[PDB]
Enzyme design. Structure first.
Site, short mmCIF file in Angstrom:
data_model
loop_
_atom_site.label_atom_id
_atom_site.label_comp_id
_atom_site.label_asym_id
_atom_site.label_seq_id
_atom_site.Cartn_x
_atom_site.Cartn_y
_atom_site.Cartn_z
CG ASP A 25 -1.90 0.93 1.33
OD1 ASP A 25 -1.85 1.89 0.52
OD2 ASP A 25 -2.78 0.84 2.26
CB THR A 26 2.24 3.21 -2.87
OG1 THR A 26 1.05 3.41 -3.64
CG2 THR A 26 3.06 2.09 -3.45
N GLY A 27 -0.06 4.22 -0.57
CA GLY A 27 -0.76 5.31 0.05
C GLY A 27 -0.77 5.31 1.55
C1 LIG Z 1 -12.65 1.15 -2.87
O1 LIG Z 1 -11.68 2.18 -3.03
C2 LIG Z 1 -11.06 2.64 -1.88
C3 LIG Z 1 -11.30 2.10 -0.63
C4 LIG Z 1 -10.51 2.56 0.45
C5 LIG Z 1 -9.55 3.50 0.29
S1 LIG Z 1 -8.54 3.89 1.59
O2 LIG Z 1 -9.25 3.63 2.80
O3 LIG Z 1 -8.01 5.20 1.32
N1 LIG Z 1 -7.23 2.85 1.67
C6 LIG Z 1 -7.55 1.42 1.75
C7 LIG Z 1 -6.57 0.62 2.65
C8 LIG Z 1 -6.68 1.13 4.10
C9 LIG Z 1 -7.07 -0.80 2.59
C10 LIG Z 1 -6.06 3.24 0.84
C11 LIG Z 1 -4.85 3.46 1.78
O4 LIG Z 1 -3.65 3.68 0.99
C12 LIG Z 1 -4.97 4.79 2.63
C13 LIG Z 1 -4.94 6.09 1.86
C14 LIG Z 1 -5.19 7.25 2.76
C15 LIG Z 1 -6.51 7.46 3.19
C16 LIG Z 1 -6.83 8.53 4.03
C17 LIG Z 1 -5.82 9.39 4.49
C18 LIG Z 1 -4.52 9.17 4.05
C19 LIG Z 1 -4.22 8.13 3.15
N2 LIG Z 1 -4.01 4.88 3.67
C20 LIG Z 1 -4.27 4.70 4.90
O5 LIG Z 1 -5.33 4.36 5.45
O6 LIG Z 1 -3.22 4.76 5.82
C21 LIG Z 1 -3.51 4.60 7.18
C22 LIG Z 1 -2.16 4.21 7.86
C23 LIG Z 1 -1.51 5.54 8.12
O7 LIG Z 1 -0.66 5.83 6.97
C24 LIG Z 1 -1.02 7.04 6.45
O8 LIG Z 1 -0.41 7.41 5.47
N3 LIG Z 1 -1.97 7.58 7.18
C25 LIG Z 1 -2.36 8.94 7.04
C26 LIG Z 1 -3.57 9.32 7.59
C27 LIG Z 1 -4.02 10.65 7.47
C28 LIG Z 1 -3.24 11.56 6.80
C29 LIG Z 1 -2.03 11.20 6.26
C30 LIG Z 1 -1.59 9.86 6.36
C31 LIG Z 1 -2.53 6.65 8.17
C32 LIG Z 1 -3.84 5.96 7.73
C33 LIG Z 1 -9.37 4.06 -1.00
C34 LIG Z 1 -10.13 3.60 -2.05
#
Ligand SMILES: COc1ccc(S(=O)(=O)N(CC(C)C)C[C@@H](O)[C@H](Cc2ccccc2)NC(=O)O[C@H]2C[C@H]3OC(=O)N(c4ccccc4)[C@H]3C2)cc1
Ligand SMILES: [Cl-]
Ligand SMILES: [Cl-]
Ligand SMILES: [Cl-]
Ligand SMILES: [Cl-]
Ligand code: NA
Ligand code: NA
EC number: 3.4.23.16
Lengths: 99, 99
Positions: A25-27
């Site tokens: 998970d690059t995000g």
């Molecule tokens: C069906 O399509 C989707 C369903 C779900 C998503 S998702 O929930 O964003 N997610 C689905 C995975 C959870 C399984 C994509 C995932 O890479 C998200 C992307 C993301 C979402 C919100 C805020 C920041 C980054 N990452 C993410 O949840 O990381 C968590 C672990 C920490 O690492 C960060 O980088 N975080 C962070 C939080 C707030 C602000 C800056 C950073 C913390 C949260 C996206 C698309």
């Protein structure tokens, strides 16, 4: 390997003597694993994203094997819906995005 | 390009003539962007994140440029903390994960 993104990039990891499936998970800045026991010290932390915040335990200096590549780093443990390997460990296995 | 993961993989996108910053996210099945005006009809979708599920608006067949690469596809709009380019559009632009 070269992983296309038609499907979720799932791999097998070994952590805490256990095999699990996890998403590359690059995000995610951080690696977050479902509830499990790990050795050593931890501290509580809150992490948030889509849907809000969860409380996790932060374990430092945890060894992990990701698709056969060893690394070390912080692992957050708590009620994540999916095991995620975040950038903190993806860097250590040499992962890059290419287009 | 080859993008390492020491920093967040942020790129500029263009949608509705507007530039935005977004994350290239291999852990996201779909593309999710902050509230904005898009043309056409939308459909309901529930997506699940780290802290639970949220409702978003699904817009199909949206023109979006990602780091200079033209895509046409589905964009979800809703209360996301960060704009996310997910696998649906990463595949379109020919992105792979490599290690
Ligand atoms: C069906 O399509 C989707 C369903 C779900 C998503 S998702 O929930 O964003 N997610 C689905 C995975 C959870 C399984 C994509 C995932 O890479 C998200 C992307 C993301 C979402 C919100 C805020 C920041 C980054 N990452 C993410 O949840 O990381 C968590 C672990 C920490 O690492 C960060 O980088 N975080 C962070 C939080 C707030 C602000 C800056 C950073 C913390 C949260 C996206 C698309
Ligand atoms: Cl899949
Ligand atoms: Cl770390
Ligand atoms: Cl490197
Ligand atoms: Cl699409
Ligand atoms: Na430790
Ligand atoms: Na449409």
């Amino acid at each position: 390997p070269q992983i296309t993104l038609w499907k979720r990039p799932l791999v097998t990891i070994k952590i805490g003597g256990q095999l699990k499936e996890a998403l590359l998970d690059t995000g995610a800045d951080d690696t977050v694993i479902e509830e499990m026991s790990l050795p050593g010290r931890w501290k509580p932390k809150m992490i948030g994203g889509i849907g809000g915040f969860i409380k996790v335990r932060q374990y430092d200096q945890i060894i992990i094997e990701i698709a056969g590549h060893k690394a070390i780093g912080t692992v957050l443990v708590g009620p994540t819906p999916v095991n995620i390997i975040g950038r903190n460990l993806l860097t250590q296995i040499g992962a890059t995005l290419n287009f």
